[PDB]
Design a protein around this ligand. Structure first.
Ligand SMILES: Nc1ncnc2c1ncn2[C@@H]1O[C@H](CSCC[C@H](N)C(=O)O)[C@@H](O)[C@H]1O
Ligand SMILES: Nc1ncnc2c1ncn2[C@@H]1O[C@H](CSCC[C@H](N)C(=O)O)[C@@H](O)[C@H]1O
Ligand SMILES: COC1=C(C)C(=O)C2=C(C1=O)[C@@H](COC(N)=O)[C@@]1(OC)[C@H]3N[C@H]3CN21
Ligand SMILES: COC1=C(C)C(=O)C2=C(C1=O)[C@@H](COC(N)=O)[C@@]1(OC)[C@H]3N[C@H]3CN21
Lengths: 339, 339
């Protein structure tokens, strides 16, 4: 079995080139190739002209992609066509993969990964040293970066909103506050399914406006307050239910604790906090561990297990009431009460 | 087809996460984790201690890596062990994957990929716009980068050198010249297999000295002259056989014709020229196209088909006598004569 090593090497080589395979997709969606292929096959020449790409070089890109299953290389007349895998890339506010692909295409996203070694050495986000500014700082100043992230978070949220509204009985609640609720699709799904609920959305000012736009167009503009705020400082008191989705994993233990104590002090004895986020269990999917690493690279965050998160709550005067699933992924809804 | 669309989204999301898998490996070889595991399992704690890493973060990397098949997570006592995939990553100047993994670890390598879009719009190197300098200039000034690259090329060449010396009959030549012959392993293999042959190695000056160190160390100084120079200005004339291996694919059409015409004028009507390079045929393998894309990004190069080489040789006053298999990959030996 001398050539057992030959396969070892081949496997590791294919992993390395995987980096390039991903940048090629990033470039394909940055140029907007997949939407040009919706009305039938097109030549790489037409594709280059329409995207502002160098004709021969785009042809190399597509030939390559087709070889690894993205797009179909028709094999004549310079024609390429949509296929199962490239169709996944059609831009759509509601597509996780398509919006994330576009978000990853951004240079500063890739540059963060350039400095992965810094994260591994310090436990800190590499985004800061690679790009000369925090991820939150950048999404505050740069409307394009802000849009790429919001769209990528927005699509995941959309498919999660309806499922959370169905896993938890909000009847009995007069008021729900959504802490850092992005574009408000979770709030919007819950209000719709509970006509008597009043809601409040908390977000950074520019995102708050995005949420106002989404809620308004959902005919819920009168049922939900928008508060351009900050959840290290401001949170509404006396609400019946608080929600926080894909926020806490963005932060280190101390910061998760600072946020939790802020929520605790605003809760009524009978109030409930729903922490909605990815949990690390005993059998974490590879896919789940990668996101945990993304979180370290972009914001220095981390995915947490059942007990890691329990340890943090007990630091913040809170207790786990219930823990229920939310869509055969790693996403769980953790129902929490004041201690 | 709900279930069909889910599976497509997942397949594509894997491709995206693949960039992160590659960088995780780059970090592991940069820190030196495989070397620390040759004498049995170690804890993430000790591995961190030895490498200067942040313990909890190194643990996450290792766990992620082990989930994708690189290293074993022993599952007890915070222990990780070498395995078949991670052994491949052990620093060995004769290992293509090991040296290439280390080459790719460099931030300037990763950043060239950051700007793939530029290359795809222009057909030119993205390396220059990403790094503020050209690849050849970087490897010229900066010894670390020179060494990373020369090692990655060096290991590939060792393999190939042998395959070439045994693929071609040099028994009728008195003098051989290797143009841009790197560290000199090809010349070394050919001189070894042909005791009567004498040789000349032409390379950029700093690289030439490395060739001198290799060739002398292997007892061939007496039969190979080292010529520091530039193949755009100088090709020594009158030799029996010229060799140019993995050089032409680095250069655009104009520049390849410059090189070829100068080689043409140095040849006696009896001389042969061996162009040794990756040839694109009908239906190339993904791996061959990835390297094509690397050439694009790093130096604005491209792999070519034989017919495409033929046209260039045509504009240069040369012609193809025959092409022979070699090493059993895309590499091929194309024997040329003056026309
Ligand atoms: N100090 C702060 N105050 C308020 N919101 C913040 C904040 N820091 C980060 N955020 C918000 O936290 C959100 C994390 S993304 C999660 C968005 C939404 N909850 C969803 O599940 O889709 C971002 O939209 C960001 O705008
Ligand atoms: N202008 C120039 N003059 C001479 N050599 C050059 C050059 N530009 C690049 N090179 C050399 O071209 C080589 C291509 S790498 C291939 C090295 C060797 N032929 C092998 O197959 O292993 C590099 O070593 C680089 O130093
Ligand atoms: C708010 O913190 C998060 C940040 C900063 C991300 O970049 C990010 C996520 C986060 O939660 C994931 C959402 O998706 C889940 N958590 O399922 C996501 O990774 C899958 C998907 N939006 C893409 C990007 N990426
Ligand atoms: C000379 O031009 C080349 C440059 C500049 C490279 O970075 C590079 C190669 C080249 O040919 C390949 C060589 O080896 C082949 N051609 O198989 C290589 O990738 C396969 C393997 N040395 C690693 C790096 N990488």
């Amino acid at each position: 079995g001398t050539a057992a090593r030959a396969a070892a090497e081949e496997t590791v080589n294919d992993i390395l080139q995987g980096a390039w395979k991903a940048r090629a997709i990033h470039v394909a969606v940055e140029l907007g190739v997949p939407e040009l292929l919706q009305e039938g096959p097109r030549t790489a020449t037409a594709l280059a002209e329409a995207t502002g790409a160098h004709e021969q070089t785009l042809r190399r890109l597509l030939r390559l992609l087709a070889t690894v299953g993205v797009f179909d290389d028709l094999g004549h007349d310079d024609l390429f066509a949509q296929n199962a895998l490239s169709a996944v890339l059609l831009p759509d506010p509601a597509s996780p993969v398509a919006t994330d692909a576009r978000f990853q295409a951004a240079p500063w996203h890739w540059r963060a990964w350039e400095q992965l070694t810094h994260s591994v050495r310090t436990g800190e986000a590499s985004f800061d040293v690679a790009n000369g500014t925090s991820f939150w700082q950048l999404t505050h100043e740069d409307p394009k970066a802000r849009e790429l992230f919001n769209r990528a978070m927005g699509s995941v949220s959309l498919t999660e909103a309806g499922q959370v509204a169905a896993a938890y009985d909000f009847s009995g609640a007069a008021t729900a506050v959504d802490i850092g609720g992005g574009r408000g699709s979770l709030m919007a799904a819950v209000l719709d399914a509970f006509p008597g609920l009043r809601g409040t959305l908390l977000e950074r000012p520019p995102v708050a406006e995005e949420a106002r736009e989404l809620l308004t167009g959902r005919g819920l503009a009168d049922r939900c307050e928008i508060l351009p705020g900050d959840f290290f400082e401001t949170i509404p008191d006396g609400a019946d239910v608080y929600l926080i989705k894909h926020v806490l994993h963005d932060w280190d233990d101390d910061d998760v604790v600072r946020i939790l104590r802020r929520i605790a002090t605003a809760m009524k004895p009978d109030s409930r906090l729903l922490v909605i986020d990815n949990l690390i269990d005993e059998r974490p999917a590879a896919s789940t561990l990668f996101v945990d690493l993304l979180l370290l690279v972009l914001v220095g965050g981390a995915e947490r297990s059942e007990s890691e998160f329990a340890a943090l709550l007990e630091k913040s005067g809170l207790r786990v009431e219930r823990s229920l699933p939310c869509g055969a992924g790693p996403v769980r809804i953790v129902e929490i009460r004041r201690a």
